Amino acid sequence: MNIIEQKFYDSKAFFNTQQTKDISFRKEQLKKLSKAIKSYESDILEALYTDLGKNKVEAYATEIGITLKSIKIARKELKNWTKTKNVDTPLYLFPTKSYIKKEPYGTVLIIAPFNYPFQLVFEPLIGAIAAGNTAIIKPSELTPNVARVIKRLINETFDANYIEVIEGGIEETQTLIHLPFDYVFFTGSENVGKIVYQAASENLVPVTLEMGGKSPVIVDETANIKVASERICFGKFTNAGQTSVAPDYILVHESVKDDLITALSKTLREFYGQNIQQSPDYGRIVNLKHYHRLTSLLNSAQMNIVFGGHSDEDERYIEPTLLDHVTSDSAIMQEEIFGPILPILTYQSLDEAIAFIHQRPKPLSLYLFSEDENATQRVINELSFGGGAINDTLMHLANPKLPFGGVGASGMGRYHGKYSFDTFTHEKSYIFKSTRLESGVHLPPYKGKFKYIKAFFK
Amino acid sequence: MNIIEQKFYDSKAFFNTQQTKDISFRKEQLKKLSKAIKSYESDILEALYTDLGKNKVEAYATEIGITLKSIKIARKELKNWTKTKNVDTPLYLFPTKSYIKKEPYGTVLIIAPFNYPFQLVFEPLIGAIAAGNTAIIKPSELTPNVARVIKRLINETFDANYIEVIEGGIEETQTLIHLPFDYVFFTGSENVGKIVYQAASENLVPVTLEMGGKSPVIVDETANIKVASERICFGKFTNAGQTSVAPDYILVHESVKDDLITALSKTLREFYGQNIQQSPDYGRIVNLKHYHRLTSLLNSAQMNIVFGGHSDEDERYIEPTLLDHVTSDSAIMQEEIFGPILPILTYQSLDEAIAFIHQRPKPLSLYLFSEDENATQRVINELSFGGGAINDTLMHLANPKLPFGGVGASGMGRYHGKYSFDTFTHEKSYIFKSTRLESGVHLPPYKGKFKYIKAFFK
């Protein structure tokens, strides 16, 4: 009765035909998706480069390669993920049989951001397809050519009543989130996350939200500064900072603080050489507006740049900038940076570092560079965060056996690997008690049965 | 800065002391809880009988015995549930180690209804305790003596900053749900469910909602009417109908429809004899208001009572009533009955039965009495519901290896057994990449590394 509603009702109607629930069907659409991505493979990278200055290597590894292997893993495991699970039954309920069926939710909404525009559409989508749902996809219009390449790939591969792509901004998102989807999957900002979560509450819709925060990295008195410098910079300088799990700021112990900076800068040259603006290993800011935002942050923290700093408006360039003498109350530590600026703060005792992170909202990721075991055991035991890495950054996302998701302000729910499948699955317990052997052990009248009932639970 | 807020902040502060995260601590509070329930064992049944007319046998089996064994299972499995899980890592990320830590959310809210007032406080609470949280409990004030017995048991056993009981109605619930709890667990009505879900969205709080609906039971042309009569009546007539998973109405095939009724009535006498009002095996309605509600339903469906019907206001008695010639549009089929009235409807083709259930919201449970395998395979394959039973009712809740929870309008999330523990757990992925063997296989510059990166995912 309206354009977006028209497509929503058609997707729901196709699901109710129930072709989606058949495993043969799902295995085949996974195949078509793998083939379609490979067919558009250079049609994914032209758009990633024009929208995000994303070079072919990292673009492939973060958006195309990761999903192609995810499709493969899902096709290999589809029969295990979907198979009904038999469940041990208690002896006092004998002969009852116990099962858990893995059934889809129905029609599913996927909202994806701008920074990994392809990855965050298709990793959940693989889950939804594998789980037997229909899907309506909302990709970011901040990366417009990526968005249309996704629409072209989806329209060419699938019928709209099975998977469809709605392009647009907040207006279209508002129409979608107020529709009665059977599941909503969202990656993006805490603020839009709140908009989605409140909109889903009205129709009692379950959701997975993956938002952000400020990911700490504790560089400890016992650290291996050399490797940490490289490891941290990979995490921070891939996609030019725009990564919900990128290190947002460093909590570096007093003693090692100056070492790090040289190590950083030196191993930053090992990454993009002198004059990074000419490197074909380093990305760009998504947009003029995000640009004028991160430049203003550099212009306000200009007293404290210690390595990097300049920027060209015409190609949305900002170089790997490192800050120093930063404090809890400065403007750079008020918001999530989501850019190539790395503020560095000093700490004396580990208790203060932990306390500093505790006072703040729970981050999506947390990183500790330390060789001390008692130190790691307490950073891990007392700080709650989404996920993270001891002596590494980012690369915990690369293992699809580890769920990826936030906690508290950083998010709820999780995906990657099987978890993508589980996010879009309802686990339906059912039992089966044959009628040949009937009894009466728990039925009425109770008269003198009390003893036997107490014995059921003792 | 206000009474309920005062207790909330104290619970949060105690959690931040971090005694709760220690497994030795959790095992001991589980022990104290088991001992405390056994100490109040007759103090649980006096209140269940005065509030719900619940006789000692069923009261024990549905509220006390089920939780005591749940405490035992949690104490036996606590080390397995809590232990950090090691995760196979991919070869191309070698030597990285991969783990999932099971950590608590923090401070937790549990809201419990009137109909199983003790069970639905303590089965989730066991989860919360086992997961390492603090807890604030909101029990129904419709069963007031049960509520206070719970407060007395909790206050005597634990300090309020660890687990506390707030008594009251919707006002106190409103104050609680708008506080920034780390998790909200709710059992109750769809309408109050919506109130809770929307209140949780404002603070980005994850929730488990367990609401209701109208649980179907398909009695099929191939059924074993005799045993089904008993099995259905156990499910329906325990707790005098007031059970979110009780059969709310029967879809009985045309041919067998009259058989059932006699079978029902006859095996209803096998349960509570002639004159049920004198049976000490049959419960009562929680309240005058719920009473005047279910009596009005009988007074409006008075043309169609075929077995049962009368009611005493002074002991809130309503007898096992069976209806006949009921239709989709009658007033009894508009709302969830939650009482001892069983409307019975006829169907011709199985497709109509499935369609009738499909058109309605997804029920918390679904029951099919049939000996035909193709029939069961499609009832199970095409109808989405919370959980349920083939050739039985209710008893799928009794197996703590099967998750218990709704889907769609009936609920989101699940508990019982380990699932109770998981509901209150954050699974935190972390990796550990040693610095002794450093490399450079995925770091920049990319120059001629493309081939190797493609190989990572192929």
Side-chain angles (χ1 to χ4, degrees), chain A residues 2-26 28-30 32-68 70-78 80-82 84-91 93-96 98-225 227-277 279-298 300-302 304-437 439-446 448-450 452-453 455-457, chain B residues 2-26 28-30 32-68 70-78 80-82 84-91 93-96 98-225 227-277 279-298 300-302 304-437 439-446 448-450 452-453 455-457:
Chain A
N2 170 242
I3 314 98
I4 286 171
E5 310 171 40
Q6 213 159 36
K7 295 175 175 298
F8 169 70
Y9 270 103
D10 274 324
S11 200
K12 204 178 159 158
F14 177 73
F15 171 80
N16 286 334
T17 75
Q18 306 210 46
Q19 302 196 47
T20 39
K21 295 176 140 153
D22 171 87
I23 291 141
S24 154
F25 175 85
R26 304 176 207 182
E28 190 72 352
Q29 315 293 139
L30 286 174
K32 316 208 308 188
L33 178 55
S34 183
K35 159 198 133 299
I37 292 162
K38 290 192 249 218
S39 157
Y40 280 84
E41 184 198 273
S42 77
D43 280 25
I44 295 156
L45 311 109
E46 99 286 25
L48 291 169
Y49 181 86
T50 79
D51 291 337
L52 296 160
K54 207 183 280 209
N55 275 126
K56 309 318 195 278
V57 193
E58 155 197 329
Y60 184 99
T62 42
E63 312 251 23
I64 306 186
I66 182 72
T67 72
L68 285 164
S70 184
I71 292 167
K72 292 185 175 67
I73 296 157
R75 288 188 54 208
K76 183 261 163 160
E77 291 293 336
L78 185 61
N80 284 101
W81 292 353
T82 60
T84 298
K85 171 100 172 319
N86 319 87
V87 175
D88 291 6
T89 315
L91 174 277
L93 299 166
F94 174 99
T96 311
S98 291
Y99 313 80
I100 291 165
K101 170 160 202 274
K102 321 276 196 99
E103 87 188 359
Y105 276 102
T107 301
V108 154
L109 166 59
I110 292 174
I111 309 162
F114 77 84
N115 60 316
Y116 288 68
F118 193 88
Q119 150 80 348
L120 308 152
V121 173
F122 283 91
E123 176 54 40
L125 178 61
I126 291 154
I129 294 171
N133 306 270
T134 62
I136 287 158
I137 289 159
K138 175 59 195 41
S140 163
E141 76 173 358
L142 309 192
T143 58
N145 300 122
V146 175
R148 171 84 28 100
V149 169
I150 292 174
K151 182 163 183 55
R152 257 146 219 182
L153 184 157
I154 291 290
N155 289 165
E156 183 218 273
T157 307
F158 311 95
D159 297 327
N161 61 347
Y162 174 57
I163 301 166
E164 169 64 306
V165 175
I166 316 289
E167 299 186 87
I170 192 88
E171 289 112 359
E172 287 70 23
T173 299
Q174 296 275 4
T175 302
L176 283 169
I177 60 180
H178 288 99
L179 289 177
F181 286 95
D182 302 285
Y183 205 90
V184 168
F185 188 102
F186 166 86
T187 308
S189 61
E190 190 212 278
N191 227 16
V192 179
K194 273 152 159 250
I195 319 302
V196 175
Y197 199 17
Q198 196 274 330
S201 58
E202 316 185 18
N203 288 292
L204 288 170
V205 179
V207 293
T208 291
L209 307 168
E210 303 224 354
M211 294 152 305
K214 285 176 73 80
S215 285
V217 50
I218 305 159
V219 186
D220 183 61
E221 58 184 349
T222 85
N224 174 325
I225 299 70
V227 312
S229 75
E230 282 156 358
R231 279 178 202 183
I232 280 168
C233 253
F234 171 42
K236 179 59 138 137
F237 291 103
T238 303
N239 200 11
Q242 301 148 129
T243 318
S244 289
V245 290
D248 192 278
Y249 64 87
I250 299 186
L251 291 181
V252 57
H253 183 280
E254 226 158 58
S255 66
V256 302
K257 183 237 203 190
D258 277 312
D259 268 10
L260 174 66
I261 302 207
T262 48
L264 265 239
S265 326
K266 273 23 145 177
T267 52
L268 246 119
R269 292 308 192 182
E270 287 218 277
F271 277 22
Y272 322 87
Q274 205 98 15
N275 191 320
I276 318 250
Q277 181 167 0
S279 171
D281 295 294
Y282 177 73
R284 295 298 181 265
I285 299 312
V286 78
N287 193 204
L288 182 62
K289 272 308 99 181
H290 291 244
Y291 182 67
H292 279 166
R293 174 212 197 267
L294 297 157
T295 60
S296 91
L297 274 162
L298 270 183
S300 203
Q302 168 169 16
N304 267 311
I305 294 119
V306 27
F307 171 33
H310 329 93
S311 56
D312 189 349
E313 170 161 285
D314 283 25
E315 68 174 344
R316 317 293 144 78
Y317 177 70
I318 307 193
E319 43 184 303
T321 315
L322 300 200
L323 305 194
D324 185 4
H325 313 309
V326 201
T327 45
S328 167
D329 205 277
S330 64
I332 189 72
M333 294 286 296
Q334 286 330 285
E335 294 207 303
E336 178 180 41
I337 302 160
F338 221 68
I341 308 146
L342 184 55
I344 296 126
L345 294 73
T346 89
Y347 83 88
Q348 263 172 38
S349 151
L350 197 81
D351 301 314
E352 310 154 25
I354 297 177
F356 186 94
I357 301 157
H358 190 285
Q359 297 171 30
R360 266 146 197 82
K362 294 170 195 211
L364 178 57
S365 64
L366 181 135
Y367 304 127
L368 161 64
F369 281 96
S370 163
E371 293 301 339
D372 183 27
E373 172 165 294
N374 285 323
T376 65
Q377 207 59 34
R378 254 196 315 143
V379 173
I380 295 284
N381 261 320
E382 325 174 323
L383 285 184
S384 174
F385 48 93
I390 302 305
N391 286 315
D392 206 341
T393 80
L394 199 179
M395 287 279 117
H396 67 299
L397 272 57
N399 182 351
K401 285 281 208 341
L402 304 166
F404 174 48
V407 65
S410 45
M412 57 179 66
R414 64 230 168 104
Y415 67 120
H416 285 6
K418 194 192 189 266
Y419 297 96
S420 293
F421 169 86
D422 300 36
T423 289
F424 299 102
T425 295
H426 174 50
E427 289 192 344
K428 192 172 81 197
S429 300
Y430 66 99
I431 64 148
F432 161 53
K433 184 185 193 203
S434 158
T435 57
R436 303 155 224 111
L437 294 181
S439 241
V441 29
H442 54 250
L443 291 324
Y446 291 119
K449 298 217 233 164
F450 198 133
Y452 282 103
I453 222 84
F456 203 147
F457 324 101
Chain B
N2 170 242
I3 314 98
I4 286 171
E5 310 171 40
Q6 213 159 36
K7 295 175 175 298
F8 169 70
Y9 270 103
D10 274 324
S11 200
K12 204 178 159 158
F14 177 73
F15 171 80
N16 286 334
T17 75
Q18 306 210 46
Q19 302 196 47
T20 39
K21 295 176 140 153
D22 171 87
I23 291 141
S24 154
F25 175 85
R26 304 176 207 182
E28 190 72 352
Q29 315 293 139
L30 286 174
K32 316 208 308 188
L33 178 55
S34 183
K35 159 198 133 299
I37 292 162
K38 290 192 249 218
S39 157
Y40 280 84
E41 184 198 273
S42 77
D43 280 25
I44 295 156
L45 311 109
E46 99 286 25
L48 291 169
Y49 181 86
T50 79
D51 291 337
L52 296 160
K54 207 183 280 209
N55 275 126
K56 309 318 195 278
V57 193
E58 155 197 329
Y60 184 99
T62 42
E63 312 251 23
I64 306 186
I66 182 72
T67 72
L68 285 164
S70 184
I71 292 167
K72 292 185 175 67
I73 296 157
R75 288 188 54 208
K76 183 261 163 160
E77 291 293 336
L78 185 61
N80 284 101
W81 292 353
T82 60
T84 298
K85 171 100 172 319
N86 319 87
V87 175
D88 291 6
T89 315
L91 174 277
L93 299 166
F94 174 99
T96 311
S98 291
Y99 313 80
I100 291 165
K101 170 160 202 274
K102 321 276 196 99
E103 87 188 359
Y105 276 102
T107 301
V108 154
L109 166 59
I110 292 174
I111 309 162
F114 77 84
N115 60 316
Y116 288 68
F118 193 88
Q119 150 80 348
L120 308 152
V121 173
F122 283 91
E123 176 54 40
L125 178 61
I126 291 154
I129 294 171
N133 306 270
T134 62
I136 287 158
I137 289 159
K138 175 59 195 41
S140 163
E141 76 173 358
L142 309 192
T143 58
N145 300 122
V146 175
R148 171 84 28 100
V149 169
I150 292 174
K151 182 163 183 55
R152 257 146 219 182
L153 184 157
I154 291 290
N155 289 165
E156 183 218 273
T157 307
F158 311 95
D159 297 327
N161 61 347
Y162 174 57
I163 301 166
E164 169 64 306
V165 175
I166 316 289
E167 299 186 87
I170 192 88
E171 289 112 359
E172 287 70 23
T173 299
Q174 296 275 4
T175 302
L176 283 169
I177 60 180
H178 288 99
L179 289 177
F181 286 95
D182 302 285
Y183 205 90
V184 168
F185 188 102
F186 166 86
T187 308
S189 61
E190 190 212 278
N191 227 16
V192 179
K194 273 152 159 250
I195 319 302
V196 175
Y197 199 17
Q198 196 274 330
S201 58
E202 316 185 18
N203 288 292
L204 288 170
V205 179
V207 293
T208 291
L209 307 168
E210 303 224 354
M211 294 152 305
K214 285 176 73 80
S215 285
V217 50
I218 305 159
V219 186
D220 183 61
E221 58 184 349
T222 85
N224 174 325
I225 299 70
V227 312
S229 75
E230 282 156 358
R231 279 178 202 183
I232 280 168
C233 253
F234 171 42
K236 179 59 138 137
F237 291 103
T238 303
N239 200 11
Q242 301 148 129
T243 318
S244 289
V245 290
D248 192 278
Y249 64 87
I250 299 186
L251 291 181
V252 57
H253 183 280
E254 226 158 58
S255 66
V256 302
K257 183 237 203 190
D258 277 312
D259 268 10
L260 174 66
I261 302 207
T262 48
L264 265 239
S265 326
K266 273 23 145 177
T267 52
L268 246 119
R269 292 308 192 182
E270 287 218 277
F271 277 22
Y272 322 87
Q274 205 98 15
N275 191 320
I276 318 250
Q277 181 167 0
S279 171
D281 295 294
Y282 177 73
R284 295 298 181 265
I285 299 312
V286 78
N287 193 204
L288 182 62
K289 272 308 99 181
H290 291 244
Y291 182 67
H292 279 166
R293 174 212 197 267
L294 297 157
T295 60
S296 91
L297 274 162
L298 270 183
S300 203
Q302 168 169 16
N304 267 311
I305 294 119
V306 27
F307 171 33
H310 329 93
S311 56
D312 189 349
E313 170 161 285
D314 283 25
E315 68 174 344
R316 317 293 144 78
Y317 177 70
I318 307 193
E319 43 184 303
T321 315
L322 300 200
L323 305 194
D324 185 4
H325 313 309
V326 201
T327 45
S328 167
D329 205 277
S330 64
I332 189 72
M333 294 286 296
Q334 286 330 285
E335 294 207 303
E336 178 180 41
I337 302 160
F338 221 68
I341 308 146
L342 184 55
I344 296 126
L345 294 73
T346 89
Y347 83 88
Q348 263 172 38
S349 151
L350 197 81
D351 301 314
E352 310 154 25
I354 297 177
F356 186 94
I357 301 157
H358 190 285
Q359 297 171 30
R360 266 146 197 82
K362 294 170 195 211
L364 178 57
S365 64
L366 181 135
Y367 304 127
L368 161 64
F369 281 96
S370 163
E371 293 301 339
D372 183 27
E373 172 165 294
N374 285 323
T376 65
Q377 207 59 34
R378 254 196 315 143
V379 173
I380 295 284
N381 261 320
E382 325 174 323
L383 285 184
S384 174
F385 48 93
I390 302 305
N391 286 315
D392 206 341
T393 80
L394 199 179
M395 287 279 117
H396 67 299
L397 272 57
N399 182 351
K401 285 281 208 341
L402 304 166
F404 174 48
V407 65
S410 45
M412 57 179 66
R414 64 230 168 104
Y415 67 120
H416 285 6
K418 194 192 189 266
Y419 297 96
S420 293
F421 169 86
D422 300 36
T423 289
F424 299 102
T425 295
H426 174 50
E427 289 192 344
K428 192 172 81 197
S429 300
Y430 66 99
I431 64 148
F432 161 53
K433 184 185 193 203
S434 158
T435 57
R436 303 155 224 111
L437 294 181
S439 241
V441 29
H442 54 250
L443 291 324
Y446 291 119
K449 298 217 233 164
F450 198 133
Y452 282 103
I453 222 84
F456 203 147
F457 324 101

